[PDB]
Design an enzyme around this catalytic site. Structure first.
Site, PDB file in Angstrom:
ATOM      1  N   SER A  99      59.243  42.261  59.970  1.00 35.99           N
ATOM      2  CA  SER A  99      59.220  43.700  60.067  1.00 35.99           C
ATOM      3  C   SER A  99      57.898  44.272  59.644  1.00 35.99           C
ATOM      4  CB  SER A  99      60.255  44.384  59.122  1.00 35.99           C
ATOM      5  OG  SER A  99      61.524  43.926  59.412  1.00 35.99           O
ATOM      6  N   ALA A 110      61.536  43.975  54.927  1.00 38.32           N
ATOM      7  CA  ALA A 110      62.144  42.965  54.011  1.00 38.32           C
ATOM      8  C   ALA A 110      61.161  42.651  52.874  1.00 38.32           C
ATOM      9  CB  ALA A 110      62.559  41.818  54.897  1.00 38.32           C
ATOM     10  N   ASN A 152      55.672  41.990  55.928  1.00 38.10           N
ATOM     11  CA  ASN A 152      56.396  41.067  55.043  1.00 38.10           C
ATOM     12  C   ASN A 152      55.437  40.123  54.188  1.00 38.10           C
ATOM     13  OD1 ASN A 152      58.578  40.374  57.723  1.00 38.10           O
ATOM     14  ND2 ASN A 152      59.184  41.876  56.148  1.00 38.10           N
TER      15      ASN A 152
END
Ligand SMILES: [Ca+2]
EC number: 3.5.1.11
Lengths: 193, 557
Positions: free
Chosen positions: B1, B69, B241
């Site tokens: 992400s 995340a 991430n």
């Protein structure tokens, strides 16, 4: 009115909920979700609770057992029971909203029942606050925040010690699976902290 | 992400720009759900995974939020001590303590039912037991018993009107997640949220600890310890991430590392490139990063140095010149099935060969299979998620850095041979393999493009649609499942906020019993594929102005 829930859909079908209180606001949300995504939501509920073999069979028994072994249902119910009435409304509003629409579907299945319930040979059941909470717990907490390989790491480390000896095995472990690497590109600049 | 947040000082014709591309795989019907909530203190618009009560992506006309995340280490395994006699007991703080247990019955459509027991200790549910050691492993999560509070923090944050109120909610989100903030005044912020253990001194978080007592966490670290930045000196916030901050430890996953080779660099390059960015320019970064080969940048210098003294008639040199001529942006040919340049195919074969000669060779079987992937592996349906730099590749990058790398090389991965000779040997392998399939004329190599599949089975592998509901996109795009953009104080409008998103295939997954598909079942699919977007409405006049239907309910509790 306080009893009134107005639902406006835009040119893409996106719903907008106008309500005066929390229970009415989440009821509206629950209702449109049951309109738009009932089969998806139903399958997502069975996936997060480990109840897929019931409707799908033999192939999902291992999946169902793995899902159930990864949580403690009673610990989740206790957190729900401790909510304040305003917090509790969100969850109750939502489940009630969905149920409202599941009752019409189950009443007039010749036009309202999602084709896939017919395909898969089963029908929708009513929801409770625990079910709504489990959707988030099962797909956000277990999907993105339950990551570990510690047992596997130990296995690897043991094999490196048997190969390079004890001190050497450990330094190779630090080369492959370091704790930190000071050259890693970071979101926060070093001047900041 | 991924996420990029642009503040006052970097924004052009706006005060703040937020672009988010959460990556969760591609599904039919859409992973996320579009919803606007107006009443009871809420005034929001956005979309959110599985129609959760709180909106992971959206804005309230004052502030905007998003997520990626986190990957911090929030889970540890406790090696529980069992007695051979006195079963269902474990030793804790010099007493034999009894375990929690529960029986479960799995009902099976057309088969016999099945029952089993789940065990739990003070540390967490039991994963596995080794009755030979008389050891049971309990998985301990720092967020255990805060699951419900995390949901509610995600809901209540929608009502914040400033950073101060927003962070009071960030402090209650207990899962390892990055949170992002932007506001109408041009302020931007970031918080690495989550509950992290306060470990005992000398606790190595990569490996199990005894659960007999001395190794028990001291508690949880305070929120003052969570990495965060407000109005950074750079004018922007980027994440894919990657590590939140200097010296922050990642997840204990053997396959997960934060090192010098990181895909977030690809975002940074583009944001530092232009002194200011407009909303179209900020949106455009999705198209570029979607198509960017992630390995080119890392190993091109290495390949260049190794082939510098080779002849032009040398095929290993030819291959490097092809790559030198390339920008790393993959484009489909007119055929909708092959890529314009063979770069990714070359790097894929080279990298596989390099890993087999270096990292794989240094690790005992079968642990060697963990480091052999190049990160190009896919199938016919294409990748299941985002493209990243493989673990083996991150470890090989540190090795090719030699002494510029902060990671001490306990074993020389090149096993006494000069780097250049291992690089040239892998290049020979590459040429031998590829020339065999495509011929000798590198200029007419028509390599296979990766594709995109909107799967009928959800991420758990469970059907959430009929198999026939599966959709296919010709071009694989390394981007969000959905993309949303929020622009605060456009100079271009009278509106204080402008927002856009794309939720493919569509808003609705409804199919009537006769096989009649909803009008909004797939009206966002083509928009997705060509990098398009639809307006998100907040105010009553916009909503009214764009209404297609109305439904009024009269309900009392
Ligand atoms: Ca750990």
């Amino acid at each position: 009115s306080s009893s009134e829930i107005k639902i406006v859909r835009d040119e893409y079908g996106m719903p907008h909920i106008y309500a005066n209180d929390t229970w009415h606001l989440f009821y509206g949300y629950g209702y449109v979700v049951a309109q738009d995504r009932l089969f998806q939501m139903e399958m997502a509920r069975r996936s997060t609770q480990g109840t897929v073999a019931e409707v799908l069979g033999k192939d999902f028994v291992k999946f169902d057992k793995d899902i159930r072994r990864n949580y403690w249902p009673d610990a989740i119910r206790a957190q729900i029971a401790a909510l304040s009435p305003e917090d509790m409304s969100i969850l109750q509003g939502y489940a009630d909203g969905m149920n409202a629409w599941i009752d019409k579907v189950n009443t007039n299945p010749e036009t309202l029942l999602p084709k896939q319930f017919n395909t898969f040979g089963f029908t929708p059941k009513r929801w409770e606050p625990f079910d709504v909470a489990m959707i988030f717990v099962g797909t956000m907490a277990n999907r993105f925040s339950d990551s570990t390989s510690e047992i596997d790491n130990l296995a690897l480390l043991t094999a490196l010690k048997d190969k390079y000896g004890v001190s050497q095995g450990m330094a190779v472990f630090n080369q492959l699976k370091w704790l930190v690497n000071p050259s890693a590109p970071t979101t926060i600049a070093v001047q900041e902290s | 992400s991924n996420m990029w947040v642009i503040g006052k000082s970097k924004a052009q014709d706006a005060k703040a720009i937020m672009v988010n591309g959460p990556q969760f795989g591609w599904y039919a019907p859409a992973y996320t759900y579009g919803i606007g909530l107006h009443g009871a203190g809420y005034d929001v618009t956005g979309n959110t995974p599985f129609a959760y009560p709180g909106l992971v992506f959206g804005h309230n006309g004052v502030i905007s939020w998003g997520s990626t995340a986190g990957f911090g280490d929030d889970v540890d395994i406790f090696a529980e001590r069992l007695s051979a006699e006195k079963p269902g007991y474990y030793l804790h703080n010099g007493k034999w303590v009894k375990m929690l247990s529960r029986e479960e019955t799995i009902t099976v459509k057309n088969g016999q039912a099945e029952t089993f027991t789940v065990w739990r200790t003070v540390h967490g549910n039991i994963l596995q037991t080794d009755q030979t050691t008389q050891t049971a492993y309990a998985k301990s999560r720092a967020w255990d018993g805060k699951e419900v509070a995390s949901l509610l923090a995600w809901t209540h944050q929608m009502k914040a009107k400033n950073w101060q109120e927003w962070t009071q909610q960030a402090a209650k989100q207990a899962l390892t997640i990055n949170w992002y903030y932007a506001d109408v005044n041009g302020n931007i912020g970031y918080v690495h949220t989550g509950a992290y253990p306060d470990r005992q001194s000398g606790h190595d978080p990569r490996l199990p600890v005894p659960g007999t007592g001395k190794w028990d966490w001291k508690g949880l670290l305070p929120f003052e310890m969570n990495p965060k930045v407000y109005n950074p000196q750079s004018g922007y916030i980027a994440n894919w991430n990657n590590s939140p901050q200097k010296d922050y430890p990642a997840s204990d996953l053997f396959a997960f590392l934060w090192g010098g080779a990181d895909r977030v660099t690809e975002i940074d390059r583009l944001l530092e490139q232009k002194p200011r960015l407009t909303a179209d320019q900020a949106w455009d970064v999705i198209r570029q990063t979607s198509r960017q080969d992630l390995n080119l940048r890392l190993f091109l210098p290495t390949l260049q140095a190794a082939t510098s003294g080779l002849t032009q008639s040398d095929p290993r040199r030819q291959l490097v010149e092809t790559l030198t001529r390339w920008d790393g942006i993959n484009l489909l040919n007119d055929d909708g099935k092959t890529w314009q340049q063979p770069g990714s195919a070359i790097l894929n074969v080279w990298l596989t060969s390099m890993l087999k000669r270096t990292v794989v060779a240094a690790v005992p079987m079968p642990f060697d299979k963990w480091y052999s992937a190049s990160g190009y592996e896919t199938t016919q349906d294409g990748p299941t998620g985002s493209l990243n730099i493989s673990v083996g590749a991150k470890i090989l990058y540190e090795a090719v850095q030699g002494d510029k790398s902060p990671i001490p090389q306990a074993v020389d991965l090149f096993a006494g041979k000069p780097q250049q000779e291992v690089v040239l040997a892998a290049l020979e392998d590459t040429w031998e393999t590829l020339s065999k399939r495509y011929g000798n004329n590198v200029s007419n190599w028509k390599t296979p493009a990766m594709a995109l599949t909107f799967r009928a089975n959800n991420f758990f592998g469970v059907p959430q649609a009929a198999a026939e509901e599966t959709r296919h996109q010709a071009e694989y795009q390394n981007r969000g499942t959905e993309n949303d953009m929020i622009v605060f104080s456009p100079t271009t409008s009278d509106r204080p906020v402008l927002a856009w998103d794309v939720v493919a295939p569509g808003q609705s997954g409804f199919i009537a019993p006769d096989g009649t598909v909803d009008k909004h079942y797939e009206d966002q699919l083509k928009m997705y594929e060509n990098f398009g977007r639809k307006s998100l409405w907040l105010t009553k006049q916009d909503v009214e102005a764009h209404k297609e239907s109305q439904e009024v309910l009269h309900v009392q509790r």
